[model samples]
Target: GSQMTRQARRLYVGNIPFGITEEAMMDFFNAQMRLGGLTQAPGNPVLAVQINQDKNFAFLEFRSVDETTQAMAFDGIIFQGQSLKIRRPHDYQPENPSVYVPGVVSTVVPDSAHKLFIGGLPNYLNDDQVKELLTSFGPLKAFNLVKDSATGLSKGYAFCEYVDINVTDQAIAGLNGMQLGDKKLLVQRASVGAK
Candidate 1:
C-alpha cells in the first residue's frame, strides 16, 4: 500500500528551458500526456517544477504508475526550449532521521512555538542524556536529539519541544555552554528551513 511504501506518485518533465513558468510546465504536461492539471497541494496527481533556479530544468507528472513510466520513457523529448528531466522525485534521505519526530508537524508550520533546537552538543551524549540535561531548563512537551538514522549514533545536535515558549527561551539562555556530565552543551532553536 502507499502507506507502507511511502511511495509518491510523481512524473518526470524533461527538456525544460530556464525561465519556464508554472503555466509553461503545466502546458507541456497537458500537451505531451493525458495529464489533468497542476496540483499544488500534497497527495495530488501532478506537480510542475524547476529543478534548479539557475539551471534549465523542470518536471511534470502523470496520475498513475503507467503514466509515470511513460513520461520517463520520453527521453530526448523537447519542451519549452530545453530538454526534460522526467523521473520520480527523490525520496527524502534525511541525514539525521532522529531530528524529525514522527506524527509531529507533518504539515509545514509557518509559526510554531513548541519547537526547540539544541546544537553544538557533546558527541558522548545520547537522546536520554540530552533529555535529562534539558529537563532542568523547563518542562518538555516533546524531545528529540538528532541521530544517524541508520546507526542511531549521536549527530552532535538535538531538539526539544517545550509546552511554553517562555521555557524554550530560558532553555536557550540558560543552557548554552552549560556543562553537562563532561562537555558543555550549546542550545538554540531549531529551524526546518534549507540548510
Candidate 2:
C-alpha cells in the first residue's frame, strides 16, 4: 500500500561529466558507495539519478538521508576530468528532525521521534527497577529493556516511546546524565540510519 511513504533524499550536483546518463549515474554512485564501504550498512542505497540534459548539473537520490550525508563527501573524484560536486538539493528540507513516534502499524512506514534508544545502563537495573526509573520521564507508550536468557539481567540498553509526546525532550534530556551512583544513561532517537 502506497499508504506508507516515499523517502527520496536527493543530492544536488554541479560540474557534471558532460555525457553521463541517468542509469549510468545511478549505478556509478552505487558502485562508489560499495567501494567506500557503505555496503556494510544498508543495501544498494543509490537509486535512479536524475540528469540535466540542459547543462552541467543533476540530482542524485539515495535510499535514505543518512546515506546521502555520506555521499556528500564524494566529491573531488575525477569523473573523466570533471570532479562532480555533491550538494544537498535546493529543495531538500528535513521536517524538523523529529524523533520516531508510533503513528501506525502494518502500514509499512518507518519508525520514529517518540521512539528513543536508551543505553549506558548500570547492569543492576532490571525490568522492575527500569520501569520505575523511566516512569519518572512521564508515562510511556511502550518500553522494552531486554534481558539475557541465562543470567536474566538487563542488556545495558533499552527502547522506549513516550506516551505523552509533549514531555519527550525534557525526559530525554534528563536521562542523558541523570546520576544513579555511577553509569549515566544515553538517550537518542531510534534511527533508520542504523546504530
Candidate 3:
C-alpha cells in the first residue's frame, strides 16, 4: 500500500490538455515562476513534473514546501483555454476505501459572507493584474489567485476580501461576467470553500 504523506509537497494538477509534452510542462511552470516573481525559495521552483497520460492530470513537486504553498495560488488558472483544477492528490481519494466509488466523490464549500469569488480569468493574469483590476472596486482586506503547488500560474479564479462589506456586492455587480482578456469573468459571493 502506497500512502501519500499528509504534508507532502506534491500537488495534483488536473484538467491538463492532452498531447502536452515534457518541454511544454517545463515551459509552463517556468512561465508561472516569472509571473509569481519568486526569488527567495531554495532550489529550483519546480523539482519535478510527472504527467499521467491515461488521465488528463499530472503530479508536481517543488524543491521546498514554501514554494509548494506559493504554487498553490494557481489552482484554477486557465491553460490552453481550459480551466485547470489543482488540489492535493489525497483529496481525490476517499478516507474509507470500502465505499470509495470512482467518479462519485463529493465536495464541500464553506459558508462565508465577506468574500467574493472571481472566475474565468485568463491563464496569464497574475496577482498584479488582478490587484489592478480590483483596485477600482475599493480597498481590499485580502485577495489571492489560487495557484498550483509547483507552478505559480493562476487557477483562473480568485478570492477577494473587502474591508467594507458593501463593496463586495458592488464589485460583484460591477465585475461579474465582465469581459477581461478573451474570457468573460464570473464574479459572485465567495464560498468558504475558497482558501
Candidate 4:
C-alpha cells in the first residue's frame, strides 16, 4: 500500500476541538490565506485531513513535504478559543536523517557484522516489543529504537547489534517478511550505508 510514504508527510494535531470535521480542518488551513496569516503562503496546501474523534487527534496531510514542514510553524494556533497543537506524528520520518535534530552531534555509531535495520513496525509497539523480538536471536550488544526523548513515540524502526556475530544472518533470515500487525517485518543489513 506504500502507506509509508504518506505517513512521512502526515501532521498530527492534538487538542483538536470537539465536533470538528475533517472538512473544517481543511478549511481552517485553507482559509488562513485570506485571514492575513503566513505571508506569501499558498492557498489549499492541505491535500487530506483525517479526524480521530475518539482520541481528540486529527491528521493533516500536505501537498508537499515542504508544505508539511511549513505547517509545523503553526504549532500553537488557536481554534475556537482553544489552543491546538500541531506537530509531526511519531511515525513521521524526515527525509534527511540528520536534519530532524539540530545541534546534537551526529555520532557515527560503531557498526558490527550483526547490526540489523528493523522496519515496517506499527509504531504503537513499545520498546520491549522490538527489543524482545530482536533479543530472541541472541544477547544484544546494542539495540536502539530510533526514538526521541521529547514525546513518548517511536519511528517504527530499530537498529540492533548482537553480542554474537554468528547469529546475524540467522536473525535477518528469521525476522524478514514475518508478519506483525498490518506490516511484514523488514530485517536487513544496516551496515551498507557507510562510505
Could you tell me every candidate's TM-score relative to the true structure? Answer: 0.39, 0.43, 0.46, 0.43
- Where is model 2 poorest over a 10-residue stretch in terms of lDDT? 100-109
Model 1: residue 159 alpha-carbon error in angstroms: 1.0
141-175 in candidate 1: lDDT tens per residue? 66555555444456887666765678877887898
Better of 1 and 4 by lDDT: 4
Model 3 score (lDDT): 0.63
Each model's number of backbone clashes? Answer: 10, 8, 18, 0
Per-residue lDDT for 91-185 in model 4, tens only?
66564321232111111235766567888887876555666677787866555565533442567887777768788889988999999878998
Q: Which is better, 2 or 3, measured by lDDT?
A: 3
Candidate 3's residue-wise lDDT over 121-157, tens digit each? 8877756567658768786655666666455456788
- Using TM-score as the yardstick, the better of models 1 and 2 is 2
Q: State the weakest 10-residue window (summed lDDT) of model 3.
A: 99-108
Q: Return the top candidate by lDDT.
A: 4
Off by over 4 Å in 3: 1-7, 39-43, 91-195
lDDT of 2 by residue, 1-195 (tens): 121222336777665655778877777778877866654376787765777776557887666666666666564333543335555666555522222323111111136766777778877665445655776867665555655534434578777777687766877788877675777777767673245
